[PDB]
Structures are given as structure tokens and as C-alpha cells.
Amino acid sequence: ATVLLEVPFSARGDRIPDAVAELRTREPIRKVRTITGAEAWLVSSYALCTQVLEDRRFSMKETAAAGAPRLNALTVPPEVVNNMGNIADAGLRKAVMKAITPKAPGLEQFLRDTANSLLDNLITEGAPADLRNDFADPLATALHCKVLGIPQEDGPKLFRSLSIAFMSSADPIPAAKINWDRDIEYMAGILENPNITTGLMGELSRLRKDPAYSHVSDELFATIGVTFFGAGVISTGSFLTTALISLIQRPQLRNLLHEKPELIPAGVEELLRINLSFADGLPRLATADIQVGDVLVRKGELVLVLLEGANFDPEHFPNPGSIELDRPNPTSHLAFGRGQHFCPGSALGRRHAQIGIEALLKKMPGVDLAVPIDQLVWRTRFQRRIPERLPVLW
Numbered sequence: 259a260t261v262l263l264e265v266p267f268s269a270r271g272d273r274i275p276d277a278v279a280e281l282r283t284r285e286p287i288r289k290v291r292t293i294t295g296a297e298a299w300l301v302s303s304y305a306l307c308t309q310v311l312e313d314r315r316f317s318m319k320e321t322a323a324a325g326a327p328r329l330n331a332l333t334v335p336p337e338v339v340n341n342m343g344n345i346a347d348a349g350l351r352k353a354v355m356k357a358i359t360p361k362a363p364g365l366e367q368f369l370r371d372t373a374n375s376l377l378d379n380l381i382t383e384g385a386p387a388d389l390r391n392d393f394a395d396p397l398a399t400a401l402h403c404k405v406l407g408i409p410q411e412d413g414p415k416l417f418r419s420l421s422i423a424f425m426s427s428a429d430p431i432p433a434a435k436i437n438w439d440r441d442i443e444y445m446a447g448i449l450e451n452p453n454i455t456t457g458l459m460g461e462l463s464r465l466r467k468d469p470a471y472s473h474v475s476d477e478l479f480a481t482i483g484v485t486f487f488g489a490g491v492i493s494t495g496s497f498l499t500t501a502l503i504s505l506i507q508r509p510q511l512r513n514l515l516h517e518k519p520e521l522i523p524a525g526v527e528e529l530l531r532i533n534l535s536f537a538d539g540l541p542r543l544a545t546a547d548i549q550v551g552d553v554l555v556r557k558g559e560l561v562l563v564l565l566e567g568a569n570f571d572p573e574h575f576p577n578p579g580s581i582e583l584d585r586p587n588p589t590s591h592l593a594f595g596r597g598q599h600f601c602p603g604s605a606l607g608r609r610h611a612q613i614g615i616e617a618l619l620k621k622m623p624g625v626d627l628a629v630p631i632d633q634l635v636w637r638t639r640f641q642r643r644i645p646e647r648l649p650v651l652w
């Protein structure tokens with residue numbers, strides 16, 4: 259005879275392969291081959307995953323080095339692999355972080371109103387409805403337009419870059435460059451547009467004219483807008499879609515949350531823990547020789563941190579495949595990563611999902627799949643696991 263084990267194992271986002279637990283038990287770090295032909299170390303236990311993510315010698319930025327073993331081809335300029343470091347070095351971290359909290363005045367009510375309106379529209383049109391294309395994704399897209407302070411009507415055209423921008427491809431993608439360059443010009447226009455005074459782009463636009471930021475490049479400011487829109491929308495849309503499947507498949511849970519919506523945040527934390535939204539391990543490149551379990555990882559080697567390996571590890575989360583709302587370590591999952599690169603949009607992602615699920619349970623308490631679960635079409639060669647359509651009735 260056979261060839262080296264290949265990753266990823268399955269694009270299905272509704273079930274974890276039995277193979278993951280067997281791997282975790284027998285070889286929690288082991289060699290695998292990625293879609294580019296490169297070799298990598300696949301890490302699958304909670305203990306080893308957290309070790310890698312907490313040790314900055316396993317570098318995110320160095321993954322972009324010419325000649326490194328790759329998980330997939332870049333769909334961004336190599337400097338953007340260090341996007342958070344670049345934000346931090348420009349003195350913009352605190353401002354970005356403040357602009358993307360779900361606590362801004364009126365933002366939550368906007369999310370509720372938007373979710374309610376999307377659902378009323380589905381209800382009027384009649385079953386079946388597609389909860390990804392006509393609910394989760396538009397909710398994500400509308401949230402991010404509002405966060406960024408850009409017009410709602412520009413959401414759809416930005417969003418349509420993302421089926422390419424988030425590909426997980428063996429080779430470079432011509433369309434990713436075309437879209438990237440166009441979306442950057444869009445966000446450069448936004449920084450020059452006097453009507454844009456709110457949200458992240460309103461704040462960046464002010465900071466750009468402030469003498470404390472006069473040497474920050476226009477490229478960086480536009481990049482922040484493109485990347486935060488893209489990462490946020492893909493991540494929240496994907497998460498919410500596959501969380502809705504997990505909830506639909508658990509009518510006793512669906513009913514407990516409908517009846518006691520105060521438990522929704524605890525439900526969302528468990529939906530997060532069990533989520534299979536990330537299609538690949540998180541990539542890092544070793545910058546030193548580092549012992550990880552039984553393997554001495556060598557400098558210049560690629561390591562992949564399998565989030566579901568950690569999140570279903572029974573030594574950290576007993577009965578890992580069960581959603582239990584009373585765990586003693588409920589936010590200790592790795593759905594938002596860990597360490598230097600911990601998700602800066604985590605609070606926003608939680609609130610998007612909370613409010614989407616709250617609205618859906620209230621408007622469609624009888625929600626159920628309208629097709630057998632095996633009929634869902636899983637997107638392949640992508641950085642997220644998502645069903646192309648999510649047909650439901652109620």
C-alpha cells in the first residue's frame with residue numbers, strides 16, 4: 259503493498275470516520291501524504307494537538323516559505339499567511355478586535371432581525387427550503403457587511419469569491435488571483451469612500467488618516483477588509499450550516515433548546531466541540547527539531563493539527579460523540595484553535611450561531627431534513643466541510 263495514508267480522509271461533515279479514534283489510540287502522531295504529494299505529521303490527540311498549537315516554534319508564517327512541504331496551494335499572497343502578525347506590527351490589533359465584537363450597539367438586534375426576515379421569507383415561499391444558501395450563508399454575509407460597515411448590497415458579490423478563495427487545492431488557482439485583486443480594489447475604494455464611517459472599515463479609514471498610522475500601507479488596510487470578510491463569512495456560514503444538521507439529527511436536543519432557550523449558549527459550545535467544519539488539520543512548519551509524543555519532528559517538516567482528533571478525544575471529553583450540556587470543561591475544545599493564532603472572531607462566531615439557532619427554533623420548531631441524510635452533497639477539495647444544499651421541511 260500500500261501507499262502512505264492520504265489526507266483528508268472524508269469530506270463528510272455529518273460523521274467522524276471511525277479511523278480517527280483508531281489513529282488517536284495507536285499513533286496519535288503519524289506520517290501522512292497531503293494532496294500536493296508532500297509528507298506531513300498528522301496529530302490527533304488532545305494532548306499533542308495542544309502541545310503543537312502552544313509552541314510557536316511550530317510556525318504558521320513559515321508554512322508559506324518557498325520550497326516547504328505544503329498541505330495545499332496558497333490562494334493568498336505569501337505575506338498574508340502572516341496577516342495577524344502584520345496587523346499586530348502595524349499597531350492595529352486592538353482596533354480590529356474591538357470592531358469585530360458582537361457587543362457593538364444594535365449589532366445583535368440586527369442579527370436577530372436578519373435571521374427572522376430570512377426565515378419569514380422561507381416560510382412564505384413554502385417547503386422545502388435550503389438552510390445553507392437561503393439562511394446560514396446570507397445571515398453570515400449580512401453580519402459581516404454590517405461588521406465591516408459596508409453596504410448590504412455588496413455582500414453577494416463579495417461572497418461569490420469564497421467558493422474559490424477557500425479551496426484546498428494541490429495547485430495554484432487562476433481564479434483566486436482574479437477575485438483577490440478585484441476584492442482588494444473594492445476594499446481600497448471603500449477606504450476612500452466618505453460614506454463609510456462605521457464598523458471595521460470606517461475605523462480603518464480613520465486610522466489611515468491619523469499620523470500615528472501614516473506608514474501603514476494601503477495594501478494592509480485593504481487586506482484586512484478582504485480577509486476578515488472572507489474568513490468570517492466562510493467560517494460562520496460553514497459552522498452554522500453543519501451545526502443545524504447536528505441539531506436536526508437530535509430532536510430531543512432540538513426540543514430541550516426550543517423549550518429552554520437559555521441553554522442555547524451551552525448547546526452552541528457543544529455544537530462547536532463536535533463540529534467537523536475544518537476539512538484539513540491546521541498547518542504549521544517546524545522551525546526546530548521538537549519531540550512530539552514518540553516522534554522527533556525535524557526542522558522544516560509540516561505538521562497538521564487535527565481539530566476533531568482533539569475534540570473527540572475521550573481522555574479529555576468523555577463520551578465524546580454525545581452533546582452533553584453539563585461538561586466541566588465546556589469551552590476547552592479547539593474549535594477556535596489555541597495559542598498565538600486563537601480565532602480573533604470567536605465571540606462573533608458564537609453569537610452568530612446562537613442567534614441563528616434561536617431564531618430557527620422559534621420560527622420552525624418542526625424543522626427536519628427533507629431528504630435522507632446520505633443525499634447531502636459534500637463539497638470536496640475545500641478548506642471547510644459543507645453540504646452544497648441543506649433541504650429541510652418544517
Ligand code: HEM
Binds near residue numbers: 596598600
Ligand atoms: C464559528 C466560527 C468560526 C470558527 C469555527 C473559526 C475557527 C478558526 C480557527 C480554528 C482558527 C485558527 C487557525 C490556526 O490556528 O491555524 C481561526 C483563525 C482565524 N479566524 Fe476564525 N473562526 C470562526 C469565525 C471567525 C470570524 C467571525 C472571523 C472574523 C470576522 C474570523 C477570523 C479569523 C482570522 C482572521 C484568523 C487567523 C488568526 C491568525 O492567523 O492569528 N473567524 N479561526
Ligand SMILES: Oc1ccc(Nc2n[nH]c(-c3ccc(O)cc3)c2-c2ccc(O)cc2)cc1
Binds near residue numbers: 487641
Ligand atoms: O496560513 C493560512 C493562510 C490562509 C488560509 N486560508 C485562507 N484561504 N483563503 C483566504 C482568503 C480569505 C479571503 C479572500 O477573499 C481570499 C482568500 C484565507 C485566509 C484566512 C485567514 C486570514 O487571516 C487570511 C486569509 C489558511 C491558512
